[PDB]
Design a protein around this ligand. Structure first.
Ligand SMILES: NC(=O)c1ccc[n+]([C@@H]2O[C@H](COP(=O)([O-])OP(=O)(O)OC[C@H]3O[C@@H](n4cnc5c(N)ncnc54)[C@H](O)[C@@H]3O)[C@@H](O)[C@H]2O)c1
Ligand SMILES: [Mg+2]
Ligand code: NA
Length: 250
């Protein structure tokens, strides 16, 4: 990582912590502890690079959350061996399809996708100044679906939309979410987006001071629409989802 990148990671996490605290009354750590019922004892976490930067970002992130983390010198299997040999209690590693946390002490394993969906949906659901239990979920994929599922389990009135009609069909029958028509816009104060696309939240769906909790990249909404409605944005590239994985595994 360049000097700029390191500054950016800490800046984004601090900014994310403030935004989450403003919205929910708790920081990311607080959200995680309440979500999972776990507490951190500064567990030793071995981050192993996989050949199928990212790991350097993970190191900065895990240190920020108080973990005793290190990155192995070797990648892949040699790295895994090195991590276990050096007393890693939790292993953190990713290929192109899967990013996992594996707690070797208790056997618990986390997948980044549902962990990210759940925490971003949790943050959204815990908006203190919410005037209803209506929540809009945009994107019902590997991150969105678990997020919507969590909101349903918390007895929220969950509206969902996905541009993939088959996935929308699946979610509407298996989860019991209300299919949302973007052409029939109702106003929401709680929005959860999990899409790799921009401009996915129509203006007409927005109300003033609404919370948009989104792990999606690029941003679901433009800066101009964000400013016009004073949207309380919760958006961070990696750390929040990583914290969710670690706490879910403790
Ligand atoms: N910030 C983080 O920590 C973090 C962690 C994991 C993933 N992500 C990001 O979250 C995003 C979603 O991840 P994923 O694994 O669920 O992807 P995915 O492909 O499994 O799901 C994305 C879904 O969004 C839907 N979609 C696309 N455009 C849409 C539109 N205009 N309206 C409604 N739905 C639309 C697609 O049909 C798809 O089902 C990705 O950008 C990913 O990189 C972020
Ligand atoms: Mg994140
Ligand atoms: Na997006």
């Amino acid at each position: 990582l360049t000097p700029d990148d390191l500054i950016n990671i800490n800046m984004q996490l601090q900014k994310a912590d403030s935004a989450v605290q403003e919205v929910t009354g708790l920081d990311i750590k607080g959200i995680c502890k309440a979500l999972y019922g776990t507490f951190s004892s500064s567990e030793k976490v071995g981050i192993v690079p996989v050949t199928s930067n990212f790991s350097a970002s993970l190191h900065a992130i895990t240190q920020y959350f108080g973990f005793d983390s290190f990155v192995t010198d070797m990648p892949d299997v040699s790295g895994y061996y090195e991590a276990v040999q050096n007393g890693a209690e939790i292993i953190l590693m990713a290929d192109d399809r899967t990013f996992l946390a594996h707690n070797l002490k208790n056997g618990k394993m986390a997948n980044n996708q549902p962990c990210t969906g759940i925490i971003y949906a949790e943050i959204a659901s815990r908006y203190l100044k919410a005037d209803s239990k209506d929540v809009l979920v945009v994107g019902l994929g590997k991150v969105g679906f678990p997020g919507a599922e969590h909101l349903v389990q918390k007895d929220f009135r969950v509206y969902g939309y996905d541009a993939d009609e088959t996935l929308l069909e699946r979610a509407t029958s298996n989860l019991g979410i209300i299919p949302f028509d973007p052409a029939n816009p109702k106003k929401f104060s709680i929005i959860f987006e999990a899409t790799p696309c921009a401009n996915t939240i129509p203006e007409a769906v927005l109300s003033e001071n609404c919370v948009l909790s989104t792990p999606g990249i690029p941003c679901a909404i433009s800066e101009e629409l964000r400013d016009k409605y004073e949207v309380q944005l919760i958006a961070e590239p990696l750390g929040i989802g990583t914290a969710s994985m670690l706490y879910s595994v403790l």
